[PDB]
Design an enzyme around this catalytic site. Structure first.
Site, PDB file in Angstrom:
ATOM      1  N   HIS A 163       0.815  -1.215   0.000  1.00  0.00           N
ATOM      2  CA  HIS A 163       0.000   0.000   0.000  1.00  0.00           C
ATOM      3  C   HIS A 163       0.851   1.268   0.000  1.00  0.00           C
ATOM      4  O   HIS A 163       0.358   2.353  -0.298  1.00  0.00           O
ATOM      5  CB  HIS A 163      -1.030  -0.003   1.148  1.00  0.00           C
ATOM      6  CG  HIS A 163      -0.480   0.376   2.492  1.00  0.00           C
ATOM      7  ND1 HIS A 163      -0.127  -0.560   3.443  1.00  0.00           N
ATOM      8  CD2 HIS A 163      -0.304   1.584   3.077  1.00  0.00           C
ATOM      9  CE1 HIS A 163       0.238   0.057   4.556  1.00  0.00           C
ATOM     10  NE2 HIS A 163       0.139   1.357   4.359  1.00  0.00           N
ATOM     11  N   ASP A 181       0.157  -7.637   1.748  1.00  0.00           N
ATOM     12  CA  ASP A 181       0.582  -6.243   1.814  1.00  0.00           C
ATOM     13  C   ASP A 181       2.095  -6.035   1.941  1.00  0.00           C
ATOM     14  O   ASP A 181       2.570  -5.368   2.867  1.00  0.00           O
ATOM     15  CB  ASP A 181      -0.169  -5.522   2.938  1.00  0.00           C
ATOM     16  CG  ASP A 181      -0.031  -4.007   2.867  1.00  0.00           C
ATOM     17  OD1 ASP A 181       0.160  -3.455   1.764  1.00  0.00           O
ATOM     18  OD2 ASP A 181      -0.120  -3.366   3.930  1.00  0.00           O
ATOM     19  N   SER A 184       4.035   2.242   8.724  1.00  0.00           N
ATOM     20  CA  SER A 184       3.803   1.247   7.679  1.00  0.00           C
ATOM     21  C   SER A 184       5.156   0.818   7.127  1.00  0.00           C
ATOM     22  O   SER A 184       5.956   1.662   6.710  1.00  0.00           O
ATOM     23  CB  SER A 184       2.966   1.842   6.545  1.00  0.00           C
ATOM     24  OG  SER A 184       1.603   1.989   6.902  1.00  0.00           O
TER      25      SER A 184
END
Length: 241
Positions: free
Chosen positions: A71, A119, A194
């Protein structure tokens, strides 16, 4: 799910989000100092900067390969010129930036080599302006396995909590929970985290932080990361460079 379990969750989650981040006890969240930022495994952690889009975290796993979230890689929209990697970067409280190992441009982006449902993404770096690869200056993170993880285990998440402080590496102690539904855990994180690396006591990378997902019911959250099992490990071995 039960109310007794929910109450318990709220109290534990509250330990990390009930007070201002600057007031969190050091054992739970703290800044990695100068000396440590140049030691393993801290130095394998860097800032993944996507020009005009986002600023997250990434981990060096190969001589020219950085592991991060899919992402996050998606923000570049397939254009590698919009991305750069800065290992152990630090912008102090006075606004002065230091990049002990330099800054690296990106050669190629593998947006979803593990599958669109996983992811994780791989970012291939170019050597520095002198022709030296990052993997030749410092050792990449040693990859372990999430197979040995148990509920209640405490690990160290290392990354760049952008939303808290820009370009300042921090460590967050995390506590695993309900592994039957994936790598979930308690701990303080922000969007910038992230791509943060999760390391065990031996300094082995066992997972990558992703985001926060619903927990117990629609009105509750928990941290979510991708564990490194046989499958993930194999793909890394096939694509590493």
């Amino acid at each position: 799910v039960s109310a007794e379990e929910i109450k318990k969750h709220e109290e534990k989650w509250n330990k990390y989000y009930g007070v201002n981040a600057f007031n969190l006890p050091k054992e739970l969240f703290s800044k990695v100092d100068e000396k440590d930022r140049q030691k393993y495994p801290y130095n394998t952690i860097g800032n993944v900067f996507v020009k005009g889009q986002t600023s997250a975290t990434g981990v060096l796993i190969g001589k020219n390969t950085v592991l991060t979230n899919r992402h996050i890689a998606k923000f570049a929209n397939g254009d590698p010129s919009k991305v750069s990697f800065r290992p152990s970067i630090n912008t102090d409280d006075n606004g002065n930036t230091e990049t002990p190992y330099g800054e690296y441009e990106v050669k190629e982006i593998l947006q979803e080599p593990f599958g669109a449902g996983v992811d994780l993404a791989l970012i291939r770096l170019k050597p520095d302006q002198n022709g030296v690869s990052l993997g030749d200056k410092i050792s990449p993170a040693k990859i372990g396995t999430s197979n040995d993880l148990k509920d209640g285990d405490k690990l160290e998440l290392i990354g760049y909590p952008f939303d808290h402080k820009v370009n300042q590496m921090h460590r967050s102690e995390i506590e695993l929970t309900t592994l039957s539904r994936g790598l979930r855990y308690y701990g303080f994180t922000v969007p910038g985290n992230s791509g943060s690396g999760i390391f065990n006591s031996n300094g082995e990378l066992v997972g990558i932080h992703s985001s926060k997902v619903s927990h117990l019911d629609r009105e509750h959250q928990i941290n979510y990361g991708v564990g490194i099992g046989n499958y993930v490990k194999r793909i890394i071995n096939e694509k590493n460079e």
